[PDB]
Design a binder for these strands. Sequence first.
RNA 1: GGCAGGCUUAGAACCCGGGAUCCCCGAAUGGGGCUUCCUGCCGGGGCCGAAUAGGCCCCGGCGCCCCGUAAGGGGCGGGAACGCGGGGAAAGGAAACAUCUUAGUACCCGCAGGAAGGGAAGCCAACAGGGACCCCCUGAGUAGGGGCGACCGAAAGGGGGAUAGCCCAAACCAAAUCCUCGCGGGACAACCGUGGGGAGAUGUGGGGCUUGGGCCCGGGCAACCGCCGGCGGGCGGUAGCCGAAGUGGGCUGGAAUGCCCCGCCGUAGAGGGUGAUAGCCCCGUAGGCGAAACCGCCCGUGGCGGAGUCCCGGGGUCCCGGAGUACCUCGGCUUAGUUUUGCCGGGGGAACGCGCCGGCCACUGGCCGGCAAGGCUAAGCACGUCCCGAGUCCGAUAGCGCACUAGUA
RNA 2: UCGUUGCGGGUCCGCUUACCCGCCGCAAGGCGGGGACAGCGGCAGGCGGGCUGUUCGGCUGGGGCGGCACA
Lengths: 50, 213, 155, 121, 81, 122
Amino acid sequence: ARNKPLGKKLRLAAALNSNRNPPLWVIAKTKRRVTRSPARRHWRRQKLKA
Amino acid sequence: PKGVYEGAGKEHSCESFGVGLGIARIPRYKGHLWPRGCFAPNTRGGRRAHPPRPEKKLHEEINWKEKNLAIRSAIAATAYKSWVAARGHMVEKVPSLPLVVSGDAEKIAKAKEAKKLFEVLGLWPDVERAAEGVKIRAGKGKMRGRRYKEPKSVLVVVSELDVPLIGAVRNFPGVDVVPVSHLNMLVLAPGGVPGRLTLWTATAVERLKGLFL
Amino acid sequence: MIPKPVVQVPRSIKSGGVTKWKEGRGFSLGELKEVGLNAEQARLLGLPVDTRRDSVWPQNVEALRKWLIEVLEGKATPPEPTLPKVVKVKRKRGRAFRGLTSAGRRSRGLISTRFRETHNYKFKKKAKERRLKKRHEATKGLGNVLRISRIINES
Amino acid sequence: PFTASAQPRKQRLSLYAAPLHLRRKLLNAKLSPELQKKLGVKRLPVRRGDTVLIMRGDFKGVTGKVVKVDLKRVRIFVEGATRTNSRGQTVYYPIHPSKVMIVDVDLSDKARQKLIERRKR
Amino acid sequence: MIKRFVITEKALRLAERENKITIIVERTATKKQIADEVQRLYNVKVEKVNTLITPRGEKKAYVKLAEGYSAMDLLTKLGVL
Amino acid sequence: RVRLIRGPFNRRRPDSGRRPKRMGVYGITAWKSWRQVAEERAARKFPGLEVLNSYWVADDGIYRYFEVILIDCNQPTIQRDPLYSGICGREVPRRRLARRLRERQRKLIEHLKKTLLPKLKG
RNA sequence: GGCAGGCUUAGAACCCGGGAUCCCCGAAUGGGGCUUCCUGCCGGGGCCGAAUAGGCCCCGGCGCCCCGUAAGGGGCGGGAACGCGGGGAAAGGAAACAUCUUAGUACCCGCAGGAAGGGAAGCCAACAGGGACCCCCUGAGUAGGGGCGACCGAAAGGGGGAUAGCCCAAACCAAAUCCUCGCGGGACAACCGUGGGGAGAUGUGGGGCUUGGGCCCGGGCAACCGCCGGCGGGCGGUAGCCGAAGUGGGCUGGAAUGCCCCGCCGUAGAGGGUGAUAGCCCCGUAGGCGAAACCGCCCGUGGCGGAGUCCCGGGGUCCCGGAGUACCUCGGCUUAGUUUUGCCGGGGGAACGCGCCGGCCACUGGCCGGCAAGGCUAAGCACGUCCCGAGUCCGAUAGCGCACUAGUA
RNA sequence: UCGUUGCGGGUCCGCUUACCCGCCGCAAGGCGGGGACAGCGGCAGGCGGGCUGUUCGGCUGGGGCGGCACA
Ligand SMILES: [Mg+2]
Ligand SMILES: [Mg+2]
Ligand SMILES: [Mg+2]
Ligand SMILES: [Mg+2]
Ligand SMILES: [Mg+2]
Ligand SMILES: [Mg+2]
Ligand SMILES: [Mg+2]
Ligand SMILES: [Mg+2]
Ligand SMILES: [Mg+2]
Ligand SMILES: [Mg+2]
Ligand SMILES: [Mg+2]
Ligand SMILES: [Mg+2]
Ligand SMILES: [Mg+2]
Ligand SMILES: [Mg+2]
Ligand SMILES: [Mg+2]
Ligand SMILES: [Mg+2]
Ligand SMILES: [Mg+2]
Ligand SMILES: [Mg+2]
Ligand SMILES: [Mg+2]
Ligand SMILES: [Mg+2]
Ligand SMILES: [Mg+2]
Ligand SMILES: [Mg+2]
Ligand SMILES: [Mg+2]
Ligand SMILES: [Mg+2]
Ligand SMILES: [Mg+2]
Ligand SMILES: [Mg+2]
Ligand SMILES: [Mg+2]
């Protein structure tokens, strides 16, 4: 939406911050055990109920 | 008493969707996992059909007079070299059965002193048998605290509780030490077979005349 | 050793005159006055006193006299007194809401009958037996199975 | 402080999940007979700078200084018990402390001496 | 109050051309508080403060210094440049 | 003072299927009496005060009147009351009761030796 | 299990005890809240500003219903299960089904505690006696209820766990009373002195509690009954510490804990790790020691108060002894309760200790047992969020839905 | 029909304070009307598919109608 409430906007900021895979050194640190994050999503596939 | 969780396999939201969908009519998931079967014994994640029940009666009761008659019978089996050799014990060095020692043996307080008396009485070879017979048992008992299987060597009967001979012999592999008033079938016939290599003290034999009869 | 009072089991009509004895609740006041003590002194010494009991038994008196001599001759240690040694009364919240006032007690039936015969007791007791599968509740219809089986076998 | 339960699952659970102050007791090693007579204590946890003798494995018989101790892994690095990787650098073999004998003690730490009196006494 | 400075390409162009320093402050800091913090901390004069809340949830303030003070000088004095 | 409407409670007719025994309305009453109901309503208006007792006062064509005695258990003059400490709580240390009872037993045994022992032995 | 840079011998990491910080929403409590955010009044402070204007910002207070003279204090929400009160089904069973059962259950509303509730004879009995209560075994599927069908179903008594008895009101005296605060004293307390305020004759306080009491008289202390928890000591919990005996010779081996040979400890051969299978390599085990701080329990001593309220003897025939209660009738729910359980509602409605209540339909007489309609009460009993131990339990499609960045995606 | 239900007078008449209905007033209270009726609670009879639960047998040249070959 063009016009947002700040409470809804802040929750979108939290989702935006967490949407990222684990860094490449974490994969090396864990010997390829930690490769994926559950907070990873696509905007078109998984919809936040914000 | 062993059992399963009372609600295991039964707390999923499932229901049978009838016929007409071309699928079997077992219960299935209601939500996004809809075709997946649930709750039945033949389904993955389903309930165990007839699991063990904690209220099951595992104890086999025995009458008191019957149980005491068996204890006298198992005591008499220790008097014969045939039964003790049949149960597995080495009795070639044993001077005679039933093996009775003097009541001065109750003052032995050290394991090293007790080990001499076993050697002097021809008992050490059977204790030595249990030492080298210890084996890492096959199966899942290793996971559950039953890694080792240790044979039985010698039952030592003392007159009364808390004599120093109990703490001096209890560390030997396979050796049991009980007062004569605490005799029972778990020490007199291991495996359910009669005839146990027993070292009686002389005072315990005198006290045996008023027990288990 | 503290002596224990010996009282008569109440002889019922069903018994037909067969009688036995039992450990009573406590020594009667009549039995205590034959040894010189009242209820306060007896409870201070540690004896169990039952002021409700009226009967007197000589065996009870002798056991009191033998034990009292040992205590007063310093040959025996008396137990702690048979009186309340702690006072713990908790604050009560929502007495009206849990039916603990006089009106709630009357509605529950505690004024007119015993706790065991009140209806809320009967509901709770039968529920505990069914939950645990206790004595008669382990089988439903046990009386009717027994009755029909008695006919078929004792025909 | 290490489970007293006899079940293997509880024994293994306490060892793996033991905090750092408890894993120090897994670094204990036997002192040499000379050091036993020199100190009067039969064990001391291995410390960096202690000289040890490897007693089992491929490097049994090698003596060297302890270059590194790891509380998390409970391993020690000793000079001589090394090798070279494919790229040529020299790397250390992790030795369990129970496979070594302390033939020389690093006693420059004042806290170590107080632990010496505790075990001889 | 101030969290850090913005030294991006847009922020650097603003400093040289419009005498503006870009900062990240607490999300609850107002324009009155930001102007007071900048003047107190650095001993300059603020003309106006333009503030926005970024899509990542932070507050960014474009502080325009008054016309006697150099925005780039304060950046290079702080050592954050 | 509490005023409430008399009669049986407002039993509700069920709106779903029931067997015929369970469909009646008239004559069915609650197991609570109006006195306990009046106590509970008075307890709500004075939150935190404990209810002691209540009694009937008057009846009219529509209403019944009760008088509920509530006590503040946080007031100092209520806590030490011999009766009000049964609702507001009471504690005595075990050392207080045990020490005096022990002291009483020591002195009673001393007196009984000199005054009751000769009679018992004789 | 990475890359750096640091911290740490001035004693870190780690564990235990005590503190600090602790955003927004949340019982949320200044007011709103269609966005976990916004916004008001008062008081104090700060900033922009020429300004004490005006504005903007920070900080504190501002919920409802109550108790209290005020000061001040309380309740509110949560917790896996258990506990107490109320409302309250159906499916199914009866081989149909309505009474009935299911079941006072599921579920809902309300209210507490670490347990709750119950508890101290208007009892049970049967002319012989028990002696508050709860919980366990039994009595017992007996009595009894019931389309006398299905089915439902006690109690007394006996054996145990544990054991404990008291108060309010009244008779009689009549303000001798209690709460609060100031000051002085007093183990930081209670309490004592003094003064102000509040409650109180619509009765504070004393006394009384079935071994009824009040009232009158005489004798005795082993009087009795309450309040505080200071000082000392002991013990236990919340971190830990000490703890015996091979890393001996040879073989196989990448590596020995394995094999052959030779030793040793054992109050310790429970169990785990270590490069394969270890009593003696290490952790531990038998066994023993331990806390600055916090907590809990026990013992000794210490400090106060009261109207003799305590015990024994006699006298008494005067006084007190709990109401919409007991009881009757009608409707209904419930109960084994049956012409006889309990209760709620409508209507009616006592007596007083010379009285009243119970003894399986009612009444009459006898006899027996008791004193309702006021309050409290440890112990012994339910539960499992949580902690410890055990296991003829399962072993990654099993076992909890979850052995894993699972109530996650 | 029992209670609410009272006060005077000779079952009937009257009265107002109960109760009820409206107006005014924040409330306090006042004004008007009805009136021991009404309304309300309990009990009792009637009408009551408005709503709740159920039953609508069997044999059978398939079921049904018929018949009873159902005693
Ligand atoms: Mg889409
Ligand atoms: Mg499963
Ligand atoms: Mg079997
Ligand atoms: Mg296999
Ligand atoms: Mg039954
Ligand atoms: Mg804007
Ligand atoms: Mg039905
Ligand atoms: Mg708010
Ligand atoms: Mg069922
Ligand atoms: Mg049926
Ligand atoms: Mg049906
Ligand atoms: Mg609550
Ligand atoms: Mg309790
Ligand atoms: Mg209680
Ligand atoms: Mg029932
Ligand atoms: Mg008074
Ligand atoms: Mg050790
Ligand atoms: Mg060792
Ligand atoms: Mg009475
Ligand atoms: Mg597999
Ligand atoms: Mg699984
Ligand atoms: Mg009328
Ligand atoms: Mg009517
Ligand atoms: Mg119909
Ligand atoms: Mg029919
Ligand atoms: Mg047919
Ligand atoms: Mg036909």
